[PDB]
Structure 1
Amino acid sequence: PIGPEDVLGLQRITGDYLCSPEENIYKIDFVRFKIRDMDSGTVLFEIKKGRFVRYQFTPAFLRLRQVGATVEFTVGDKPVNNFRMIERHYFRNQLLKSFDFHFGFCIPSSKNTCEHIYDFPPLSEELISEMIRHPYETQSDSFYFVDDRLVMHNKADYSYS
Structure 2
Amino acid sequence: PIGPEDVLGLQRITGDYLCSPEENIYKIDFVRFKIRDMDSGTVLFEIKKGRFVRYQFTPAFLRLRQVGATVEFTVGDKPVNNFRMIERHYFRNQLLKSFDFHFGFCIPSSKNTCEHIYDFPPLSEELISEMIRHPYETQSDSFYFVDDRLVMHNKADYSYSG
TM-score scaled by length of structure 2: 0.93
Partners of 2:47 and 2:117 in 1: how far apart?
18
Equivalent residues of 2:71, 2:115 under 8 A apart: yes
Equivalent residues of 1:144, 1:150 under 8 A apart: yes
Per-residue CA deviations over 1:49-86 (Å, capped at 9, x if unaligned) read 33111111111110112321222221112111221111
Per-residue CA deviations over 1:81-110 (Å, capped at 9, x if unaligned) read 221111111111222121112226422112
Partners of 2:40 and 2:66 in 1: how far apart?
9
Equivalent residues of 1:79, 1:105 under 8 A apart: no
Equivalent residues of 2:101, 2:116 under 8 A apart: no
Partners of 1:41 and 1:104 in 2: how far apart?
23
Partners of 2:97 and 2:77 in 1: how far apart?
33
SS at match of 1:98: strand
Partners of 2:149 and 2:66 in 1: how far apart?
32
CA-based RMSD of the aligned residues comes to: 1.4
Equivalent residues of 2:99, 2:118 under 8 A apart: no
The equivalent of 1:32 in structure 2 is: 32
The equivalent of 2:20 in structure 1 is: 20
Partners of 1:54 and 1:81 in 2: how far apart?
30
Q: What displacement does 1:122 show?
A: 2.2
Partners of 1:80 and 1:104 in 2: how far apart?
10
Report percent identity of matched pairs: 100
Equivalent residues of 2:87, 2:141 under 8 A apart: yes
Equivalent residues of 2:103, 2:114 under 8 A apart: no
SS at match of 1:6: helix
Q: What displacement does 1:121 show?
A: 2.0
TM-score scaled by length of structure 1: 0.93
SS at match of 2:121: coil
Provide structure 2 residue ranges, at least 5 long, that are not aligned to the other structure: none
Partners of 1:103 and 1:116 in 2: how far apart?
9
Provide structure 1 residue ranges, at least 5 long, that are not aligned to the other structure: none
Q: Which runs of 4+ in 1 moved over 4 A?
A: none
Partners of 1:30 and 1:46 in 2: how far apart?
12
Q: What displacement does 1:125 show?
A: 0.8
Q: What displacement does 1:12 show?
A: 1.1
Q: What displacement does 1:132 show?
A: 0.8
